[PDB]
Design a protein around this ligand. Sequence first.
Ligand SMILES: O=c1cc(-c2ccc(O)c(O)c2)oc2cc(O)ccc12
Ligand SMILES: [Zn+2]
Lengths: 47, 161
Amino acid sequence: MAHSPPGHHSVTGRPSVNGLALAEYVIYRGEQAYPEYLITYQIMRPE
Amino acid sequence: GTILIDLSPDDKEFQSVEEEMQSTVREHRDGGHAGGIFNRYNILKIQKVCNKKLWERYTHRRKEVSEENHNHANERMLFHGSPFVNAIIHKGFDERHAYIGGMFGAGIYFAENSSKSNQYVYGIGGGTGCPVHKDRSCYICHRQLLFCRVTLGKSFLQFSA
Ligand SMILES: O=c1cc(-c2ccc(O)c(O)c2)oc2cc(O)ccc12
Ligand SMILES: [Zn+2]
């Protein structure tokens, strides 16, 4: 596992092409996330 | 130390988590290759993950980040998809859940789009698809995502294609 950029606690990947894409994020310490909900699902075949 | 509590579909908490799941689906540039072809999900169960030790671990670090960033944790709720969610919920996130080859370096990755994290549920690039049918687009097999509380603190802004 790498380190944060100096002076930062995470990285934000801001989408710059796909106008519809939301952000993605990276943390470098496991203690910076808590797995609050387990969601069980299936993807649905479109009509 | 982990216990899982089932949320009722009548519970407002179940409903707000489902809505975030469904409303952050998007089309992907791979036409469904990694994660499958779908516009929405069938939610089978939503469970609250309870572990005292992992939670205190989280809040301890959160306070540290906060005091380094004018009392602002910059906390988000974000999705995480992987083949190892059942280890994560018992032992917490650590360096074994790091995407060594990701765009932004060897760290632990989260998405605002649920459909993005869905691409990683069977492995990087969807791996070989579901274990039972080897179908990245399986409509039968049960999949699991985590909806996670994440401390970002001061976040480095990377513009990216
Ligand atoms: O949910 C994610 C899981 C993972 C992921 C990647 C590699 C792993 O070995 C892993 O366990 C999870 O990667 C993502 C990358 C993104 O750009 C956005 C979300 C994820
Ligand atoms: Zn299957």
